[PDB]
From a paper:
The paramyxoviral phosphoprotein (P protein) is the non-catalytic subunit of the viral RNA polymerase, and coordinates many of the molecular interactions required for RNA synthesis. Here we report biophysical and structural characterization of the C-terminal region of the P protein from Menangle virus (MenV), a bat-borne paramyxovirus with zoonotic potential. At the interface between the disordered linker and the structured C-terminal binding domain, a gradual disorder-to-order transition occurs, with X-ray crystallographic analysis revealing a dynamic interfacial structure that wraps the surface of the binding domain.
As in the prior crystallographic analysis, each of these proteins was fused to a non-cleavable, modified MBP tag, optimized for crystallization. For one of these proteins (MBP-P329–388), crystals were obtained in multiple conditions and used for crystallographic structure determination. The structures were determined by the method of molecular replacement, providing a total of three instances of the molecule. Helix α1 is capped at its N-terminus by Pro335, which orients the preceding residues (329–334) such that they form a clasp or latch that runs across the top of the three-helix bundle. In particular, Arg370 and Asn371, located within the loop connecting helices α2 and α3 of the BD, interact with Ser330 and Ser331 in the latch sequence, through their side chain guanidinium and carboxamide groups. The electron density associated with the residues within the latch is unambiguous, but relatively weak, and this is reflected in the atomic displacement parameters of the structural models. In all cases, the main chain isotropic B-factors of residues within the latch are significantly higher than values in the bordering helices of MBP and the BD, suggesting that the structure is quite dynamic.
Numbering used by the authors: 2 to 370, 1329 to 1387
């Protein structure tokens, strides 16, 4: 990583040209060059490259991936003053707290909504159960009721969760990674409803992000499910669209997993102060968020001063109604295993090559912790050993804060040995 410049990674569905404009302003004002990139699969590439001390100075993703990055030692603790923290909503800071430490700057709150074509469907269905009948009517007019991305479990989760599916059981502020909720009666009911839609030819198992976006924006389908980043392309499409609450299932709200788009600082970056400068004083300003939002809408931004304006938009009100019906995702390391397992279950069941029950049974075990935990007594001994070692051997306070955060998340002797090695390898 090159000292004296910033390299920033952000997903290709976000307002990266807008962010590059913020980068250009930073360079104009400070002399420091900013390069924005949008690599494919960056949520998988970041851990790969950062593990060897490489990669971007700043990484943007929803917060759910960030506990894994932090636990792996890839993220510095961020250092905003209390005065800066007060400029963002408290509920957003909780999404980016890991083992007591702030690990990223929250940018914006993302929840899926039902997006509908008002010309085809002036009053969109309140319930999932209404959709088959609606699709039959629209099929007789050469249209379809609903198309959305069936390849990414983010989009199907709101239906799986509606009647009781859950990721990890959450009690007394803690997630139990041995207690997974993807093959309970509610998860089965929701995924069965989706698979039935496909069986009855109301949806196609092959539908992906591009296929659904193209169909909605051409007026071929009456409804889609998507986030605020999608509104830009609909605005130029001519479709007269609305954004509303997701349909209920078995009388229960759809419960989207809510993401907070967040910006973390690579632990190996020699540019941590520049990164803080850019994020606090350029990006998290009304002007900076406007530039990104104008490119692709962010959703409900974390910066109070700008959200006061955006919240007046009915599309943002709908976003936040859906967010309130769902749940802020956990940020725990096990989230990537969860998402891979649910991805597999939905694709395999939707393709008809496996039953819903078998798909979700496999996912239930595949999402859960694979390795055993140490006993409570042994684990406390390992943690106290490492805390002593960090204080003994690591002179830099920021580096100590990072390692102390990682200590909080070890689960077994192998984790203890792995983290001990990382501490012993710490450079000056
Ligand atoms: O599908 C699983 C995927 O869900 C979320 O990714 C969202 C992301 O949060 C949105 O900002 C947008 O980019 O759509 C993605 C869905 O394709 C999780 O954040 C991600 O970790 C998980 O793999
Ligand atoms: O929060 S409490 O601990 O009080 C009850 C939590 N508990 C979780 C599991 N679901 C099963 C739904 S179903 O999938 O079986 O319908 C019921 C509610
Ligand atoms: O935060 S980063 O990881 O990017 C680099 C932080 N780094 C720590 C060490 N000090 C030495 C001050 S001096 O006495 O050498 O001037 C410079 C700043
Ligand atoms: O020192 S402490 O009492 O806290 C725990 C020491 N204890 C030694 C035995 N191994 C068994 C795993 S294995 O070696 O059989 O793989 C677990 C850890
Ligand atoms: O949800 C709505 O109704 C907004 C109004 C303009 C475009 N869609």
């Amino acid at each position: 990583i090159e000292e004296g410049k910033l390299v920033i990674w952000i997903n290709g569905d976000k307002g990266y040209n807008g962010l590059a404009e913020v980068g250009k302003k930073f360079e104009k004002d400070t002399g420091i060059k900013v390069t924005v990139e949008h690599p494919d699969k960056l949520e998988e590439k970041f851990p790969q490259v950062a593990a060897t001390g490489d990669g971007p100075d700043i990484i943007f993703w929803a917060h759910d991936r960030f506990g894994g990055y932090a636990q792996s030692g890839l993220l510095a603790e961020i250092t905003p003053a209390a005065a800066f923290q007060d400029k963002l909503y408290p509920f957003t800071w909780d999404a980016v707290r890991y083992n007591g430490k702030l690990i990223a700057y929250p940018i914006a709150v993302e929840a899926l909504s039902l997006i509908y074509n008002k010309d085809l469907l002036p009053n969109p269905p309140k319930t999932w159960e209404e959709i088959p009948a609606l699709d039959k009517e629209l099929k007789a007019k050469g249209k379809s009721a609903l198309m959305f991305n069936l390849q990414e479990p983010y989009f199907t989760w709101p239906l799986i969760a509606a009647d009781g599916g859950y990721a990890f059981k959450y009690e007394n502020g803690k997630y139990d990674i041995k207690d997974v909720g993807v093959d309970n009666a509610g998860a089965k009911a929701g995924l069965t409803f989706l698979v039935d839609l496909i069986k009855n030819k109301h949806m196609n198992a092959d539908t992906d992000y591009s296929i659904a976006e193209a169909a909605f924006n051409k007026g071929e389908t009456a409804m889609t499910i998507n986030g605020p980043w999608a509104w830009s392309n609909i605005d130029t499409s001519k479709v007269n669209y609305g954004v509303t609450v997701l349909p209920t299932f078995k009388g229960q709200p759809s419960k989207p997993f809510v993401g907070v788009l967040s910006a973390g600082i690579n632990a190996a970056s020699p540019n941590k102060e520049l990164a803080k400068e850019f994020l606090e004083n350029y990006l998290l300003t009304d002007e900076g968020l406007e530039a990104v939002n104008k490119d692709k809408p962010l959703g409900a931004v974390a910066l109070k001063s700008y959200e006061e304006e955006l919240a007046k938009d009915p599309r943002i009100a709908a976003t936040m109604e859906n967010a309130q019906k769902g749940e802020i995702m956990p940020n725990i390391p096990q989230m990537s295993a969860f998402w891979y397992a649910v991805r597999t279950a939905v694709i395999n069941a939707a393709s008809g090559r496996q039953t819903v029950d078998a798909a979700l049974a496999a996912a239930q075990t595949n999402a859960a912790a694979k390795s055993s935990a140490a006993s409570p007594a042994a684990l406390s001994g390992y943690k106290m050993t490492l805390l002593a070692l960090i204080k003994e051997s690591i002179p830099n306070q920021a580096k100590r804060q990072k390692f102390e955060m990682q200590v909080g998340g070890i689960r077994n002797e192998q984790d203890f040995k792995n983290l001990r090695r990382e501490i012993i390898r710490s450079a000056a």
